[PDB]
Amino acid sequence: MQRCDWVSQDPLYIAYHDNEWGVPETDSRKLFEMICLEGQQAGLSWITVLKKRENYRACFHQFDPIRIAAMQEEDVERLLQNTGIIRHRGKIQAIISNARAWLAMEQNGESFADFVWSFVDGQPQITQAASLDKIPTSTPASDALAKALKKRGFKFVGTTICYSFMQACGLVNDHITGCFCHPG
DNA sequence: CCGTTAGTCCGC
DNA sequence: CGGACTACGGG
Numbered sequence: 733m734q735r736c737d738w739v740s741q742d743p744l745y746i747a748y749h750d751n752e753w754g755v756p757e758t759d760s761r762k763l764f765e766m767i768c769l770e771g772q773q774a775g776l777s778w779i780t781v782l783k784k785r786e787n788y789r790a791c792f793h794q795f796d797p798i799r800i801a802a803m804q805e806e807d808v809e810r811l812l813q814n815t816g817i818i819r820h821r822g823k824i825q826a827i828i829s830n831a832r833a834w835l836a837m838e839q840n841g842e843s844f845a846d847f848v849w850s851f852v853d854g855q856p857q858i859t860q861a862a863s864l865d866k867i868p869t870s871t872p873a874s875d876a877l878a879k880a881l882k883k884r885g886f887k888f889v890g891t892t893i894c895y896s897f898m899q900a901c902g903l904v905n906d907h908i909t910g911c912f913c914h915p916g
Numbered sequence: 917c918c919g920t921t922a923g924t925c926c927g928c
Numbered sequence: 929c930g931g932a933c934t935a936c937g938g939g
């Protein structure tokens with residue numbers, strides 16, 4: 733089975749690639765979880781975060797924004813000691829900030845899913861790249877999404893993070909042409 | 917440019 | 929073994 737260049741031999745990474753990455757996600761809560769996990773990747777490899785994803789789901793209340801938004805300074809200082817996540821105060825606080833930011837949107841008219849999908853025009857763009865070096869790391873759309881998220885109070889959401897989120901949640905489909913998951 | 921994680925790599 | 933190095937926040 734030929735797969736994208738970034739997939740290691742780790743079966744956890746293989747299942748994530750085959751079953752989740754690039755598959756259009758339209759659920760607001762799932763999208764919220766993914767923008768949070770992409771921010772947790774900053775400066776690190778994605779596999780580090782993926783391997784910890786079950787720990788994140790346990791520590792952050794299955795990414796239910798109401799439960800997250802109720803977390804306090806004491807929770808942050810507790811999580812800073814938890815070796816199952818990334819022990820970085822700014823990143824832990826970012827998940828809490830992001831949950832409050834999502835609530836401020838959703839209690840006030842704006843679907844997070846409608847909002848992120850507004851940065852793509854119709855069907856997800858399918859890459860024409862045969863190799864990872866020909867796939868962009870950010871685009872005009874990811875630039876726009878990052879700027880809009882920051883305006884709305886989100887943290888750890890720059891253009892490169894936003895583009896990786898777009899790939900992951902299938903707002904673009906960046907499976908290389910030779911990958912068995914490419915919609916060839 | 918400087919600071920940071922977790923993890924890899926490299927030199928002593 | 930300890931240090932360098934490695935997409936944000938910062939100055």
Ligand SMILES: Cn1cnc(N)c2ncnc1-2
Pocket residue numbers: 738753770773778896897900
């Ligand atoms: C290589 N890769 C695969 N999947 C994700 N969700 C990523 N975020 C950053 N880098 C990523």
Ligand code: NA
Pocket residue numbers: 849850851852853854
């Ligand atoms: Na759209």
Ligand SMILES: [Zn+2]
Pocket residue numbers: 735736749906907908911912913914
């Ligand atoms: Zn692929």
